[model samples]
Target: ESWVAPLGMGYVTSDDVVNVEKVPSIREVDGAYVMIYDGEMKIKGKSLRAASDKVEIASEDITTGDIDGLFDGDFVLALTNPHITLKSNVKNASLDCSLSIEAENTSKKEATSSDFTLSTVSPNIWIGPLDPKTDAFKFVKNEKLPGIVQIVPQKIHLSLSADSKQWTNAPADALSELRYAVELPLTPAPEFSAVSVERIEDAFDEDFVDYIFSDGSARIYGEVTNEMPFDMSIEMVIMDENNVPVDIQFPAQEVKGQSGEVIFEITKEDMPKMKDARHIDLNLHLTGRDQGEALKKGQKTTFNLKLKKEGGI
Candidate 1:
């Protein structure tokens, strides 16, 4: 039977392995299939500009000499060595700065409606020197003089822009320090009158009358050496520790010529009160001004006075 079935025998064979695994390129299986791509891109641009808040700058009072002669005379006198300098610690940055000032003439008898405006914007990119080439600093006619002028600063502004390349990783607050200065040279006028006050701290000691006025009487006898342009009337008053006027009076003296004298006596009654005396108030009045004459720049006014014992032992 085996030899008869040999023609009917058949055979079939196959080697198949189904191994499931994740793809090496698709490592991210975020709930589903996912893929990623990467590349490079570049951007070139300027840095963002910044502006600073208004800062306060130093400004000093501007005082001038006897420029009264210049008033209504149509003339200008420039200040000497007037300059403004600004300094900063920042580097690789350009700055634009502006300084604004308001000038006012403050004279007792010489006030006007004219107000001065002085301002300077950096001529170029402003590395920090301000030296105006033309009439930048000057005093003109019809303006007040023989007095101290006040300067008020209105604004000081600064704008910072990039002078070089900038990056995203740059630090902030690049400016750490800033400084500025202003200088103006003004001279004193000769026509100025000085009503000098005798400060008791140095003029008369507390025990001066006790030793010098043994007779309890003294006289302030003085001669005038007047070379001044105008006639002067001199009056004096005594002041105590509280600055209150004491019950003492002196006759007002008039000096017209280059030579004069004064005689005022303090009786024994008033001499004892000198122990509380602190100072003397000298009231001087100038008269007889020459309207046609122009006051010189450096005129001098000299007033001489002396004190002597009146019949003292």
Candidate 2:
């Protein structure tokens, strides 16, 4: 409560403006601090609570001019709103009470240290809002072919270019960045599929007169199949009965139809006997493909695979 006016100033107030009987107990109110005392009251009725020296104003009685300067400036201000309202003018509107001396309570985690985790985030990329990932990642369900649903392949790209830390402003880095990315994939999928290894085999060289066959070395040759509709070379790890690993590779072969074959020949210097060998580990590899060199032309498929070994050309 404090002194508001010269004993007789137009005091038209409504929303939460109190008119006490003195001026020293003045306190803060919504956006304005005011001193209220015993004031005359006349609201759409007979006069009531008319004070000795002041008159309390009501919102309806406050004229348009009063709305512009209705608050008292003698006290501090408090922030309290009546739903959504717009107020004008000022009175000594101040914030922060100098009472509490501690930080807010930790019902949640406290930011006590300078070093703290800003956040954990991972971004996503898409292809036509479909399956192919922007890079080495994606998601999908099987497609229905005929009556049964089957899966197919399609893909997109994802990258972290290094004039790259996300993109910066135009006048700089992206303008001249040495964007280089090296991939070491520890993912389980076909870096092998895009090259498409349809078959591998070893047999007698009865038809071949090669020196490897000329010596007592049995000719080990195999056919690679290309289903990717593009020409490619495929590599597979050949494991012997003891499960020892040996590298086997075929060069780039012409892209052929579904029934096409890639013919390759190797001496026993590479392959162990089938009877003494584990299954061929198909590791299809292609250049500039399979970000895994990378790999997404895709959906995953769980079709069956069959291997048949017999006599060859």
Candidate 3:
């Protein structure tokens, strides 16, 4: 086989035809392929970066009851160790993503005052537990804290950029995916309401007094209704005009919790002292929850009492 040849500048190949327009050229000369390059290959810029736009991961409407169930009713106080694991397929680059939290409260206002504080466990990465109790998450006496109703997961954003002489050292793929698995044992601040039986006044006449206890020892039926979130007991004392105790009217254990009816046996001997009755004095007892139940949103516990004398026909 014969082929054309040029001095040190280039060579001719017969095995394949070479294009002059291409920088690195390969062609066959005689019976073999010859490769040639014009000059040294050069690349500029020392840094390169890959970025992903913010994308939504999740958004859901949640309730305190549902949140309570998730943590086995332990959500009332605070979460001990809850973690969010973030994973990516890309390698050789610092793996990190921007994270944010947004929530809409159902009642009260978390925007005004955050019920709980969340802080990252690690400084370099977010794949650790967020301390939910760094701030006080307990409910004050008679205070109801607003709760998260809508959990709006913020966008996922990552920028893999490095400037180590050449951008080629960056992550392998510009388009990367992130899988974030969460063990969300959310500790939403709980709500609580106090059962109040503050002193109240009642106008008592012959008829009204007879309607409640009547002339002799009678069994008076009194209805006690408690809509409070927690259990409650009450002790009622009947007072005369001078604020002196006339009688211990209602026993604390007579009516208990959520709602009920109790019978008051007014003995005949008690009828004389009861004539001086005026306003009523009452005390409230609360049976707090162990896990601290949350108060219902847009609702309140109402304590009410009604009395009827079925003794007289």
Candidate 4:
């Protein structure tokens, strides 16, 4: 019996807004002051009779005045952090991404003066400006202030499915159902086929057969072997150095039983740094397909590959 594999689909939405807190200290300068005047004057009478009073002025009045200083204090302010959140319907999916935010002081004081400014020194936090603009105290002409702030998201959410079926085909054996685990060899230069060039020609009537190199193709190959009977599908993708996909060619056949080979191919032009090339890409995806049953002992697979150069004599 055979069955078509179910289609797996998912997507990411907008990111969450993280709030950043802002705290600023108040700054004060010398305030203005006023002065008072006090003095004594002599008075003369309208008539000669009043003139006699100038002879003695026993008592006099004198007063002194002082000014007070203004008090300056610190204040608290709050700024929200920029954050992003993603949602997916796929179960057991994991996500990874990054975000960034920038704050600037646009106030005239901040532009021409050096009173205060906003800065984001940490991942999700910002510090700046001795004083921020508020409804009551709109930034003044000579005061320092914050400018327009910017927020940017660097990476997208990365997700991995929890359900084994979401990532690969259903387990072919009971052991595969127990837990998901896979380990790759840590060889400095693992032996594998990067490209394979095969030339085939028809037999002709002559002392020597002239083989025509018409294919000029490249292929990547690998194989697996197992003791128990099982079926498995493999997928491969080609991409550029930047990890951008160029062209993809899937296998035309499926491997069933204890062991089988995995193969993929593309034109020689897709190989990078080749003269007169049309396309060049790196191998990206090499994964197994969903298997209905579990694999048993004695199963193994081997792989070999080679790349061809075009326009070569």
lDDT of 3 by residue, 97-188 (tens): 23332233333223211111111322122233333342222211111112222222122122222232223434444223433333333222
Candidate 2 TM-score, true structure as reference: 0.23
Better of 2 and 4 by TM-score: 2
Per-model lDDT: 0.36, 0.24, 0.34, 0.23
lDDT agreement of model 3 with the native? 0.34
> 2 or 3: which has the higher TM-score?
3
Clashes of 2: 28
TM-score of each: 0.35, 0.23, 0.35, 0.22
Write model 2 residue lDDT over 214-240, tens digit each, in one string.
222222233433322222344445554
lDDT of 4 at 61: 23
lDDT for each residue of candidate 1 in 1-313, tens digit (9 for 90 to 100): 0010010111101000000022111222332211111111111233353433322222223223223222222222222222333334443433332333233333222222222222222112111123344432322222222122212111212222222323222334333344433333222123323232322232344556455544547666566554434455777677776888768887887776556776666787777666666556555444433332222223344434456555533
Residue 92 of model 1, lDDT score: 44
- The predicted structure with the larger lDDT, 3 or 4, is 3
Q: Which regions of candidate 3 fall more than 4 Å away from where they truly are?
A: 1-196, 206-214, 254-257, 296-313
Tell me which of candidates 1 and 2 scores higher on TM-score.
1
Best by lDDT: 1
Supply candidate 1's per-residue lDDT for 296: 29
